[PDB]
Amino acid sequence: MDTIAARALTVMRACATLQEARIVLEANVMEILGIAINRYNGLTLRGVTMRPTSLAQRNEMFFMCLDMMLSAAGINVGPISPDYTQHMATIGVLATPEIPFTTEAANEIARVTGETSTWGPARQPYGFFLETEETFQPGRWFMRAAQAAT
Amino acid sequence: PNDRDSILTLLLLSTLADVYTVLRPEFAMHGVNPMPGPLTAAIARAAYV
Amino acid sequence: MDTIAARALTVMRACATLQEARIVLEANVMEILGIAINRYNGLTLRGVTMRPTSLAQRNEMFFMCLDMMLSAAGINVGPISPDYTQHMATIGVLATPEIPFTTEAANEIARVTGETSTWGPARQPYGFFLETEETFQPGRWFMRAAQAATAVVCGPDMIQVSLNAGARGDVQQIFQGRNDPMMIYLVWRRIENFAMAQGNSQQTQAGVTVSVGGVDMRAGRIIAWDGQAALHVRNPTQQNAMVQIQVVFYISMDKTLNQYPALTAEIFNVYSFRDHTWHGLRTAIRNRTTLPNMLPPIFPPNDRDSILTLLLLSTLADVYTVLRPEFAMHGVNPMPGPLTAAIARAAYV
Amino acid sequence: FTTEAANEIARVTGETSTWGPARQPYGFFLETEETFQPGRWFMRAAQAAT
Amino acid sequence: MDTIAARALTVMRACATLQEARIVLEANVMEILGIAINRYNGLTLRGVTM
Amino acid sequence: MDTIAARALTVMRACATLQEARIVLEANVMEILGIAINRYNGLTLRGVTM
Amino acid sequence: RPTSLAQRNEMFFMCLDMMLSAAGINVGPISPDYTQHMATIGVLATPEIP
């Protein structure tokens, strides 16, 4: 399940490297991106390009990331656009062990699931007595009846 | 937040956000009306209900 | 996503077919299980037979159903047993389009998702004025100071108006307030014999009329009241009168136990004891959910996940029944004695 | 250029080119000229709530 | 010494990639753990598996 | 313009890899420094080494 | 095997056509997109259909 997220994540961060690629450096990424896009385009029947240029192509790729992102989050947004439609099938694309994920994505998730599943000591943000209904003037004496220390 | 799904979702969105930036996607969305004029802190303030 | 649940359902329902050997498998079933079990074993690396018999063979199969059921519900039970361990990968088997599902399962899910995602009109379960802090004696006269007509509550679905001779007035406001009723069904009667402020009997004369939105309505007949129209009561008689208006029933867009076919029985099945192993299991599973770990929720859930989870758990219950799996759980101590209603009672906290 | 560098810049260009809500650094009434003793009664003339 | 730490880090970070059994790894990972595990198991004499 | 910054960034981050003397450069890195230094030294005429 | 939408609608229209023929209903002109084919009954009367 986390693996699915890592995958989707990897994909997006990778799509965010085509501002102009002209021979990518990260061979790792490519291998994965190709794989993913093929698998996607196969089950989707859409036409995502490795190197988008038009706009429709860019939208297409975006929609893909969106689809994956949503599937990874376990979200069904429903009809929110006349242009975009969410393909539930997307989950079946990320479930394939055929798709690798970056070490980055792996660790990113490992951290989240890691701490999110357990507890730990942490400096709290606000004052201790913040959720108090009554407060007194500072420096002003006050001794509650019958008490020697108040 | 304190649950996986919360944190995760944010991360995915944060990333998808950047993807949005770089790709410059253009499309419609039910209930949204685009104002193409350059964009200012003013126009933005308004968008937050 | 629904497909995933449909699969996991089909698989379980299929395993239930495996009663006690003397069976000739429905050709169709064989095919399905085989594909599933195959793929499952290829991801679990566990040894699931298509036709179990030993026990350890049965456990393995149950465990499979369990793994799938949980994955379909999106639950992570964690370390609850030494004998069983949940494989999260179970989801990937269920996401693979290579495993089919029955028409039965498909519709079963489609119904849950279908209704759960939208709203609808449904006869509510309890009396209209149930969530009320104050109630008055039924049949007893009561006129608030300075009023000619005084409507008041006397029960869960009961109100009675005290009219002075010749007095009239609107009443609808006593009903309004409780968020959203779509159509209240009424029936009003004359309190022919009621108690006075002092205790003496008093008669209500024939002639008192009740009109909704203007049109005059008979007594003892059901009325399609839209909750907005003017509920006007008149007393042309020269005597004191007291009429009771009864909310026979009303409909709202709140989810009832009739959102999904015989949901009730399913829930019963889920919450039923069976044995300590089942009990403790089912408990531990719901601890991950918004559902009460061992006592029927007062208010019928309204989210896909809840309804779904119940159905899955309900079926997985039957699987437990046919398979007779035997394993341990942290904190569970099986009492071997024949099992009586007594032993069961005690188990529920 | 690396994906690391790509994302790095993409983020900068992204957020920098637009605005967004954020927990401000200092106390609200920091840029105030006058302050009154805490817990001390003070009623401005002609007012019942000051 | 910085190098030593950077390595140890890189390796662990890569081991963190093993969330499942069958899954395919990014070539980078394979290369790293491949060499690492070799020389490690070499001087370690223990039996680590990719 | 983002690309430009990202490039310059990548280069620096890459030069940062030169800790020890004998360490074998990350394959990926050399592809960078190689192209860079060649182009740079081309314009500069200076003699920078990998 | 539907995929588009018009393919999905087309199928739904079929289910509608049948659903109606079965209930012995004739809704008439209720949509510019849909047109009920009375012929649908002739289909459901075919013994070949299970």
Place this chain on the structure above:
Amino acid sequence: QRPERIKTTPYLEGDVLSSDSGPLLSVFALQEIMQKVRQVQADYMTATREVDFTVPDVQQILDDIKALAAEQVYKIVKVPSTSFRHIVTQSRDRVLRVDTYYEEMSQVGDVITEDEPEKFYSTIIKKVRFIRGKGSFILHDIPARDHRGMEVAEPEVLGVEFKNVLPVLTAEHRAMIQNALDGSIIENGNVATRDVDVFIGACSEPIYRIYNRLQGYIEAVQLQELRNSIGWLERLGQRKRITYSQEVLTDFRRQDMIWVLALQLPVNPQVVWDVPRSSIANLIMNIATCLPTGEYIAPNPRISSITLTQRITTTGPFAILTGSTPTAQQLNDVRKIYLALMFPGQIILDLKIDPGERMDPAVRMVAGVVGHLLFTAGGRFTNLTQNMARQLDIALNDYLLYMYNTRVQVNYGPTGEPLDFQIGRNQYDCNVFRADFATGTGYNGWATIDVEYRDPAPYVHAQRYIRYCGIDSRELINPTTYGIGMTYHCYNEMLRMLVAAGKDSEAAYFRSMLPFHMVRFARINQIINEDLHSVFSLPDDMFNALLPDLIAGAHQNADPVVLDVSWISLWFAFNRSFEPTHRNEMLEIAPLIESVYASELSVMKVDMRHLSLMQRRFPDVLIQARPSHFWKAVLNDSPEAVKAVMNLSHSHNFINIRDMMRWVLLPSLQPSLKLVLEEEAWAAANDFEDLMLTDQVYMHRDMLPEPRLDDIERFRQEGFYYTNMLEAPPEIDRVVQYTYEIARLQANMGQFRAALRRIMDDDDWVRFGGVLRTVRVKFFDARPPDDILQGLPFSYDTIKYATETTIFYLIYNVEFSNTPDSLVLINPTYTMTKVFINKRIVERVRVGQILAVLNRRFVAYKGKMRIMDITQSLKMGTKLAAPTV
């Protein structure tokens, strides 16, 4: 044995006509396409570069590729290459080590010149390749000697030549070294079991790099990788309905066997389809590999005429159907047809007219009808040419209008366009059987779905799966809806028309023929989307693109092949059905061949990639460039088989500079052992000094170091070697930088010498940047040749840059008969050229320091073990016991 081939009723059991196979058709296809061109070009006024449209041997090319799986890149040795050598000076306390690597590298490719850029390119490739080869080590069984309870490595497995030195060693030095030798132990040593030996031996850096990356691969790529890839085939096996063995793959790995897999199975669709102008070649490959062997069946003679009495028999309206096949001249012409529809819109059909052979016009009628119900001009994909269709409509029209019996009411339409009329006593449009490509209203699947995307495909280019007339092969296995009615819409409407208009007599023929027809089509479908979807299959993208692009006349890279038929052939094609016999043997190994092709392909792309950058890296070296140059030199040093697959279509004589550039820039690659090695070795290549060619070449008038000899025994010094290789470059401010252009101009003007001299006189430096130059290293015992001392970095016959640049090492040797000043000369001896590399090629060392080289790691597989490459075990019919996902 025969799954669906089971013939239940005699109705399907007809005679045998001919038979075809994969290699049969694949050749035929090419042939036909080549005749096409010669026959036109040779026929009309033609103007273009001459090309020899030859039909190559498909089998032998294929068989050669299957032969590649064998060729392994790794080389198993028992001892590593030398790496280091020691050269002795007169001195007895100091020596000089040399990194062998650099020497070998020195003399790899040809000398570099700004004239031949092609020469340059290959020169580089050879050099890179060299590195990759020098690095594919394995080290199996090492000379482990016993010494003091420890097992140590024999000096042979280390990386040094020191035997030279030994004899001049001081008892002390000797001893030191001996300890260093029996110093390097086998780490684990006393353990037995082991499996591997770890020692310390020396090694040249670049080489080491490869050794390591390799070592990693062989240990990373094991069972699982293999498991996956096989499972893929196991999956494709089901799609192709493969008959399976009783065996299973135990993932049992013997403790002796270390596996070496070189290619993974799930092949990247794109690498194949990225190749420019591939379309044809790919297609043919698709045929030659996947297209099974089968025979054409004739219908039952009883379908037409039937005997009632010895004297009374019925006669089919087409008595002409007794024509003996118009030679292969047209029989082949039928094969075209079948093959055409068996490859969707990939091959289109067109008339062809020999003004000779006079046929009876009736042929046109029949063919007009036939064509309409056997070809798909459906708005989904299309089989025929635009004009092809018209001719069939005119054939149809002309013949609906030919009434050999009583005439029916023909109510013509306002348009003169054929098929406007409405013949029939009940009217009926014939306008329906017109010819709209966006609708397909006339011909096949006019009201049908023939492109059914469904199920995830084992391939992924194409997920589609074709249903001609909406008949799934399943209807054969188990029927769908009776035998009476099989009729698909079109064939049905065809009947109705034939009736209303002309006559039933013929419509009866087609009525009874119908089943035979659909059966033939059901089989065809099966064959298409089942029996032959390979990598060469063709992506749905391009498929869908075909139809509309054809209408607009775009520029479809995958231009469909237009084949020309014969009116007659339609009848014949209609009366033959083709029933597959055996699946071509190539099939089960197909995927493997594919992997080989794809992976070898990508490797080239990689090489070419980096080479394109070369021009921009050093624009001065290769002024006269052009991409064709490197891609030519790459194609040169890469395997024939692959190249031939690309040139099946003869594309190589068409691929424009731009076309190839795009392919280099394309980014779809297929990983392979070869690939990773090439890329890694390739990476280290980026240094250039590691290639032995530098920009760092200077000139500076320098004296030859003539020392004073006061203590001859003190020349145990570094034997005072000289060398023009600089310890470090001069201060950048004191250097006059020179460009190709600058030098060029000054020289053409005849000012270069002067300027150069001035600089020399001023004791300044001058660097010659922009160009690379091959660098060589020579050593001397005494006063080397003037052409070396006073050698310059350019020719003066116009100033010609580059040249070889010799880095010498002059060793000073002296006898006891040498007077202190004897070495001095009244006039100095000058040396101009100097070089700088920032790589420790030749280094002055002590003696006890000799062995310091060790350094490097090293892991060697113990003699006990057997290294085997499990690369050819990627056959399809292999199932595993552990199912996998």
Place this chain on the structure above:
Amino acid sequence: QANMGQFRAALRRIMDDDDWVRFGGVLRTVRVKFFDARPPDDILQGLPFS
């Protein structure tokens, strides 16, 4: 089981447990023979599998 080199072992244990095993669910033809004395090992120890 055989893929893990556990097949033989498994069978042995089951037999040692007195428990019975039954392969398949296929019909199998039945043969009937009579003996006067100790039958062939093929009949006694003939295993219903290979």
